[PDB]
Structure 1
């Protein structure tokens, strides 16, 4: 099957202009998709929200640190009964270390970087402008319980879409922006 993106190329260009103030063409846009990943969908949503707005190299470095358990991912929405931790950012104490999600996102970012290179864009000036994760289909299963009943035990897959744009280096950020209250 074919999975569409939530944002077309012209809307991506409009968002790029509205967020940075430069005008770019569809040829400066690179997309990647990872359909039906077997991982946590809530943590996938959190990771996509965090990595939106970084450059590709910044996102890759942070995801590698996440996989090495050296930098956490902030949990803003799916935070019920989740512990507090010391964080490298400011404004939010709920952090996790999603390793499986981080590896799948690293594979997706590798595909996106290859697509940008094939289109001929400079990878050092590629900024992530759109990132989304959706609940895909379910691989169902049953867990037997006491007293002869059986309850659902499902693997809810994830579809991840990412779109990045090649921007002028005078507008591309040079460091992480880690004030999540303002972010």
Structure 2
């Protein structure tokens, strides 16, 4: 089945003008989709939020450091009973190192890099403008319990969509922006 994006190319350009002050055409937009990935759905949402507004190289470098357990990911929404940690950013103490989710996002970023390159876009000026994860279909399974009862033990898959735009180099951020209160 085909999966649609929450945002069409026409509104992606409109969003780019609203956030960067520049006008671009749908020819400067690259997309990729990773349907039904077997990974944590809550941590996928946190990753998509964090890498939005990064350049593609910035997101790749950070995620490659999550895999090595050298940089964490902030957990803003799914934080009940999650411990605090020292963080490289400012304004939020709840952090995780989702290795499995990071590896899948790196494959999606690899597909997105190719899709932009195939269009002739300059990858150094590619900026992630929209990222979203969705709970996909469930793969049902049961866990036998005590007293003759069985309870659900499900694999909830994740649909990840990503859209990036090629911006003029004079408006592209050159460093990480890591004030999470202001972000």
The normalised TM-score by structure 1 is 1.00
CA RMSD in angstroms, aligned pairs only:
0.2
What are the ranges of 5 or more consecutive residues in structure 2 without an aligned counterpart?
A: none
Deviations 1:2-56 (A, max 9, x none): 0000000010000000000000000000000000000000000000000000000
Q: CA deviation at 1:59?
A: 0.1
Deviations 1:90-142 (A, max 9, x none): 00000000000000000000000000000000000000000000000000000
Structure 1 distance, partners of 2:41, 2:124, is: 29
Structure 1 distance, partners of 2:44, 2:53, is: 16
Q: CA deviation at 1:57?
A: 0.1
The normalised TM-score by structure 2 is 1.00
- SS, match of residue 130 in structure 1: strand
- SS, match of residue 43 in structure 1: helix
Q: Which runs of 4+ in 1 moved over 4 A?
A: none
Which residue matches 1:3?
3
Structure 2 distance, partners of 1:42, 1:142, is: 21
Q: CA deviation at 1:160?
A: 0.1
Structure 2 distance, partners of 1:9, 1:35, is: 19
Structure 1 distance, partners of 2:155, 2:120, is: 38
Deviations 1:38-95 (A, max 9, x none): 0000000000000000000000000000000000000000000000000000000000
Corresponding residue pairs, total: 183
Q: After the TM superposition, which residues 57-72 of structure 1 pair with which residues of structure 2 at under 5 Å, given as runs?
A: 57-72=57-72
Q: CA deviation at 1:144?
A: 0.2
What are the ranges of 5 or more consecutive residues in structure 1 without an aligned counterpart?
A: none
